[model samples]
Target: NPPPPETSNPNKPKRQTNQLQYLLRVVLKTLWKHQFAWPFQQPVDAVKLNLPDYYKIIKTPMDMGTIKKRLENNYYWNAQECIQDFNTMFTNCYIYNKPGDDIVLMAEALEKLFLQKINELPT
Candidate 1:
């Protein structure tokens, strides 16, 4: 008779299914923290800012829609696949703002922290 399937690592299945979700949520929380200027506040509508270039400034390649889809579909097994694009988007956002500004610095810090977490995970 064939041997039964082994389940030596109980968390393996959970990690495979929800790792991206957890990481994405973590990043989102970090982002909102700085954007709102306070914890536990929702993101204000970018359009409401009324700046002529608000959309352009806010529209990073790593838009929430794309990230949402990727996380929901589990399209990326390893977060490393997203590092370059994320870094680019964050850098662009950073440069669009004044140096030493809170938003740019926050985005920079969050991106670095996110990348650190991504690198810590198995690729």
Candidate 2:
């Protein structure tokens, strides 16, 4: 093999790719596993910031700020993609491990966040 393609950034942080993937898997699984008991209590503004943080934490290969800009500026403030990102973070992690209580919690939080965002929207 020539070389394994890089799936993470070498400029911003020094976390191992395996570590990041592991964390992502864990976080996502945790969210789904505890969805029922998960608290969706974040403020509307806080929900908005989650996408950037989620991207930074899960997919370090991409630029967090850039993704934030694209989502905020180009996406017209739609939370669909962010929600999808969270879904991807978990679903993609299935091969690593089965989701548990932690994933359920995350799912709960995400569901609440998305709902809060929707409530804040101009309907």
Candidate 3:
């Protein structure tokens, strides 16, 4: 199991690969199973689907400067930027874990982040 969240330094870095891998794999499987657009595997079809640019970007090594710029933008991040950040986090992690290994905790964290972003939007 991953270590408990650090309470002392609320701003401390958190593990990212496991969640990112799970999210990406689940998305890919859903598309393939339903005969929908396969973003990474089928780039030609992916274009038609208009998938998030980050989907393609994450396929390669992410640029730290780019991630930094994205975060610097106070305006909430787009899907592409979010994926890039995910890639950056995954690459930076010293301990790597397989996706879906901790689905319950992953879902909680995912939902929390999702909601936080949504709440940040101007009402």
What candidate 2 gets wrong by more than 4 Å, as runs, is 1-67, 73-97, 101-104
| lDDT to native, each model | 0.50, 0.36, 0.35
Question: Stretches of candidate 1 above 4 Å error?
Answer: 1-22, 25-46, 55-60
Q: Which of the predicted structures, 1 or 3, would earn the higher TM-score when compared with the native?
A: 1
TM-score of each: 0.52, 0.28, 0.22
Choose the strongest candidate by lDDT.
1
In the range 6-35, model 3's lDDT, one tens digit per residue, is 223335443434333433344323322432
Ranking by TM-score: 1, 2, 3
* Cα RMSDs, all models: 12.7, 15.0, 16.7
Off by over 4 Å in 3: 1-58, 61-66, 73-111
Better of 2 and 3 by lDDT: 2
Query: How many clashes (backbone atoms < 3 Å, residues ≥3 apart in a chain or on different chains) does model 3 have?
Result: 0
Clashing pairs in 3: none
